[PDB]
Amino acid sequence: NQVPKWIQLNNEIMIQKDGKFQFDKDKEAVHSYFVDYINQNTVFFHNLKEKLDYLVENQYYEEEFLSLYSFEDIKEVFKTAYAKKFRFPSFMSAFKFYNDYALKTNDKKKILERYEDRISIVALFFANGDTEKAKEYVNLMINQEYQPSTPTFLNAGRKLVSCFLLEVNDSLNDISRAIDISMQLSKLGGGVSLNLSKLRAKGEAIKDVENATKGVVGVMKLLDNAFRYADSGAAYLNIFHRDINDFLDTKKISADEDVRVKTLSIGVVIPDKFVELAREDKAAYVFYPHTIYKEYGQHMDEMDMNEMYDKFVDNPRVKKEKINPRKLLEKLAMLRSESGYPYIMFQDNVNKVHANNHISKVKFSNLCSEVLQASQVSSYTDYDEEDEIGLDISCNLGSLNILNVMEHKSIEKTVKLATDSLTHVSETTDIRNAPAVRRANKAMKSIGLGAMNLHGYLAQNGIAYESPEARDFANTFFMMVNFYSIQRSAEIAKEKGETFDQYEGSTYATGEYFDKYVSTDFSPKYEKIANLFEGMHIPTTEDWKKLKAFVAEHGMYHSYRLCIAPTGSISYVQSSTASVMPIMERIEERTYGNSKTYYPMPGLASNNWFFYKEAYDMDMFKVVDMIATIQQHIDQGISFTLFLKDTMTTRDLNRIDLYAHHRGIKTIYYART
Amino acid sequence: NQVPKWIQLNNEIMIQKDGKFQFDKDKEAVHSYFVDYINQNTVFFHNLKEKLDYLVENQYYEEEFLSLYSFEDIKEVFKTAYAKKFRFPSFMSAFKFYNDYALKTNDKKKILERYEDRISIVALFFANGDTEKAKEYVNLMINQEYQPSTPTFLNAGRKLVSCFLLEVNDSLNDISRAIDISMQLSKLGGGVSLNLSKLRAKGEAIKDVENATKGVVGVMKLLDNAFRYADSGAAYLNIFHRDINDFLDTKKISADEDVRVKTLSIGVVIPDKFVELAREDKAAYVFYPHTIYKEYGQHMDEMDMNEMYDKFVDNPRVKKEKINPRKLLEKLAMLRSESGYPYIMFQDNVNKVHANNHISKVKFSNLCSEVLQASQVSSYTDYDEEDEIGLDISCNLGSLNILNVMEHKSIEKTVKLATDSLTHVSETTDIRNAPAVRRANKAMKSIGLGAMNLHGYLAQNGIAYESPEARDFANTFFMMVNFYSIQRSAEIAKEKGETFDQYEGSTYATGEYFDKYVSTDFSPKYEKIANLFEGMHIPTTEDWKKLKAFVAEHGMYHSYRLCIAPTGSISYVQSSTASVMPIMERIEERTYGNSKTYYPMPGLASNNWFFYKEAYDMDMFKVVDMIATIQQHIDQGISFTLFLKDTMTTRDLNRIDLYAHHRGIKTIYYART
Ligand SMILES: Nc1ncnc2c1ncn2[C@H]1C[C@H](O)[C@@H](COP(=O)(O)OP(=O)(O)OP(=O)(O)O)O1
Ligand SMILES: Nc1ncnc2c1ncn2[C@H]1C[C@H](O)[C@@H](COP(=O)(O)OP(=O)(O)OP(=O)(O)O)O1
Ligand SMILES: Nc1ncnc2c1ncn2[C@H]1C[C@H](O)[C@@H](COP(=O)(O)OP(=O)(O)OP(=O)(O)O)O1
Ligand SMILES: Nc1ncnc2c1ncn2[C@H]1C[C@H](O)[C@@H](COP(=O)(O)OP(=O)(O)OP(=O)(O)O)O1
């Protein structure tokens, strides 16, 4: 029943040594725990050969790509990994890896993989034939310069994507098909979310008899019950609906029998017409999209509301409903101050930067609230009858370290290896239930790249998070990685000799995304910011001009390359801080079980004490200015989590919303307290 | 606000005239209501031609089969119907027909069809080309000798079956497919019920990881939520399951959050192994059907429990669960005394008479608890992958009058016309969502025929319902209609030159159903019973021998011909009593709205006062003896509703269950109080 030594060492960290903390007690809490637990619970082997034979015979890996190398090359990459002798600085480093991310035994009572082993296997999977590229993947990974996504780093050749975005058409067979597809993907752990802007409203005529539609809320109840059969999902709605108030009745603070959501996150996508109508404080008009489909031929989200609003107003066919949009703004701010629900997307601001607007307009995002692509709704008829194959969205993940890239300065080769690995993931992944997402991943070849450790690295350098220096740092750095990513995508579309589909209507084929970058040089205007960027060439606008000429020469390979997700589940094993969102506490405190670990921030001392600020005590306006500074280079959206408190008010949240709509911010996340 | 005259006349019926009731006040309550309401709210026409033109142009009928006759032939059958000048004797006769069963206007504020019109249109639909057969259908219908089923008589050529029985396989794609099919048929108003004997138990391994099955109760919760999207359904389970106690937790008298059923009726199908194990008062063993499928290869209901019970006992592979079956009998009787739930089916007793036992064994029935056929479960893979087409059950309805057939004595031609009409219904009906029931209706060509007015007719003749005279009457009469139905089916399979599928393995191809009837002449042993049957030839065993030779000569057309449903919704417009279940009250009293109609039984006077007994004051044992006497001629089951009271006990209900299992009773219905 006795607490072991390393847990007591972690308890000893919080002992006030002259007003500070016993940080080095972590290390023994590392070092004893390696000795007393890790090295005493590992399965013994006599060599590498019998170890690999045990891995083969005990049915733990796909043996094919493992047999794409010799045993000597496998031992070479293993010796290369073990030549690091990686010394974990954090208790949570080993305390999450060998606890969760490491592949253990079948009874899960001993250790199988080491920290080098999983990384080397993932490197062999990413390289898939080459030994030296796998060693480069190791050097990108064993120095923690890159970290792949959670199922990607988890089940590389074992027994894959957490981003899925679909639509729904207005037929019962479509409803059953979508229910089936969500149940198919729910057992695979992928993040599946949708949007319901193409369904008929409550109390409408179902094709023969008047006043027959039970409403969308029954379908939401059905999907909420359907998600109770697996381990989660989400759905959206365009704002100009009569049941949009009922869309606010979903996440009601009085949890009803008739409305009881537990899994489906909601998010209201607001075009500029609604903030236009609420800004003038004039009464607005939502409509019936089935009457719109019966009158004009298309759904309401098929057309822009700013054009066709008065065209719906004067036309007597589509039935009206008149409300106050300012009262809806008040109730939205009220629900956001209650919880932080729902999400808000400025889809016109998304299309204001969207390169593939020639295909469609983005009208929704994921649960991770980051991916913004084009889409097409399908249509499913009966079983004997033939159906349709629309367009879908699937964007893989995987982050890098700002700190390790900025210290090791292999940034272009980092872009090379990360792009090749994400290309390999997009190639290998296949879906055999809904062929629409299969066709979408086959057609778009879309990837998503992000990064972490912004506040911890820059605050570790002695730079405030609320500095314009850090904003210019993000500006120049993401200009450089934008240069390298577009350079790599154009090189890859050259080397393949082939680009993604509908590349010609995008801004890359016309060079319009580079039109911002052929002028307006984002060279660092601050001295410490430039000195951090010293040691490497900063690409100017002429480099962007040659990049534009090379893109117009061949083409670009990925319709999207970048997304930013809250990838906080891997910061501990990356021995690093979170993503570009600033930290909340200098010391995380957890009760693991029968214990209290006290994990401080990595690099926490008294010099960066006030550089490691608190998220409850920051100006959010400088944060969204930084968000816009980063969004100057990101194609898709960024999951900006709002860091708020309980004492704030709804009208200041409204001012934040007007400020973000003024900044052209794409999406927002659930708020803090 | 004043109560109209005919309602006051109906109130005047209950006035005690020398200890009796003012029956003839019904007639003025008929006759004034015809004058003051019916003839004042009908749409005027100048002739028949403009009336039919209005029916065509106002989109009320399928015009094709109406154009399969001349206007003169239509006027001939209309003149034939109007030559009856049918005088309604009951207030509820017109009060349900022109209120509900008649096709009214689009705003439903006037009358379109007359009582002759709907009947004549239905007759033209049944004949479909012939005028004289339609007039014969009129004479069968306008004299109330036959009444078709509710959607059949309702929507004959307008804008169809209430019996659907399916199965479920053990895959998620199968689950989604069945959910889709139930949602497809729910909008069409058909009675859809299933059985869940081929699903894995709660807390079992889902194919890779141990203890992962949430259980069948979540699927039941899902189907209960899914039926909230339309206007009802049911599901069963074989008794030898570990979750069979949880099957009793469904209709729990404490309505839970976690278990809240509102639509799904349950019914436990009990083979002779369970009453064997509960009879000896020995501890029984339910099993895990997924372990059974993994061990022997088949589900548990694939094999007989009486054989394979000890083979499951000695085999250590299938995991056991040991209970007391007598305690389950006690809790079953407790729930039946609480409500009347669930249903009880002796499937071995069903197979003891089942002619198509060469196909499979009957393991379930419908919500109407009457139809017992063979079945095969399907299997549905993914969307791109190929699926299976199993067997299903769909049995049409439609009843006749014992009184009118016994008075008009056209019993063989009644069988002819009813069989041809039910054949036409089975031919015209098609399903375009689940092709399995389409294939099943195409393959079986199965019909269902029943009758009504047993207690009212025989009690109107001066015969007690609890007489063995009435039992011999039902014996001889249903022997005669069995003779005529088998004769008609054999004649029809001769005239088509073609029988139903798998006819050769049935008892009809081997003559074994006639082996009971080539001996044991069911001639009437009572004098008044025979005198009611006098005036027509009673078929002896030699007629059954020639029938057997004619069946072996060609074949029989329908795998099933007979079923008995509680068709009480049409007795009022048939001016008749209920089905073979005896009446409960001599005078039905209803509060229609702002009123109190008092509809007595048809033919209620002081002579048949004690012949019109009360169902709370009868011996149920004579009733189930009558049930077995009728079941001596019926192929399928009969929905015997239990007529019980509150003062009775559970052990007497157990004695009733043992008595019915002793009688070979197929199924039972929900009980009374
Ligand atoms: N931070 C850590 N990261 C990885 N392994 C560790 C860490 N801390 C302790 N250990 C491991 C390595 C050894 O197997 C054991 C402790 O021995 P350790 O002294 O840390 O390594 P070492 O063998 O390279 O140095 P030395 O020769 O001085 O013993 O547990
Ligand atoms: N009985 C019902 N109860 C509730 N919703 C229904 C019912 N029947 C159909 N629906 C729902 C589901 C469908 O998405 C929507 C439209 O009805 P449905 O007949 O299936 O579409 P449709 O493709 O035939 O054309 P339309 O859009 O004109 O109705 O209404
Ligand atoms: N029981 C009923 N069945 C059908 N129609 C009825 C009934 N009772 C009254 N009516 C109808 C028929 C007439 O249109 C009107 C009442 O006239 P009614 O006397 O019953 O018929 P009738 O016209 O054949 O006889 P009469 O020539 O003596 O008036 O309402
Ligand atoms: N994640 C899940 N949660 C709950 N039930 C599931 C889940 N995944 C599958 N199932 C259910 C539905 C299926 O009817 C049943 C069997 O699982 P499933 O993998 O779909 O069948 P299977 O055809 O692949 O073979 P098997 O019967 O061996 O499992 O368990």
Numbering used by the authors:
A (entry chain I), B (entry chain J): 4 to 162, 167 to 238, 246 to 687
Paper text:
Ribonucleotide reductases (RNRs) catalyze the conversion of ribonucleotides to deoxyribonucleotides, a conserved reaction that is fundamental to DNA-based life. Nearly all aerobic organisms use class I RNRs, which consist of two subunits: α, which contains the catalytic site, and β, which houses a subclass-dependent metal center. Contrary to all other class Ib RNRs studied to-date, the sole RNR of Bacillus subtilis displays class Ia-like activity regulation. We find that B. subtilis RNR has arrived at a remarkably similar solution to the ATP-cone through the evolution of two unique allosteric sites that modulate catalytic activity by inducing contrasting quaternary interactions that either enable or prevent the full range of motions needed for RNR activity.
A 6 Å resolution cryo-EM map was obtained of holo-NrdE under inhibiting conditions (100 µM dATP, 1 mM CDP), revealing an unusual double-helix with a hollow center. In this structure, each helical strand is composed of alternating I-dimer and S-dimer interfaces, leading to a non-terminating chain of NrdE subunits. Importantly, the simulated scattering from this double-helical model captures the distinct secondary scattering peak observed in the experimental scattering (black dashed), indicating that this structure is a stable species in solution. For both filaments, excess density at the S-site was modeled as dATP. As dATP acts as a specificity effector for CDP reduction, its presence at this site explains the formation of the S-dimer interface between adjacent I-dimer units. Additionally, a distinct, protruding density is observed at the I-site that is best explained as a dATP that displaced dAMP. In the NrdE-only filament, this cleft is unoccupied and partially buried by the double-helical interface formed by residues 660–665. Consistent with this, our cryo-EM maps of the dATP-induced filament display empty pockets at the M-site (purple stars).
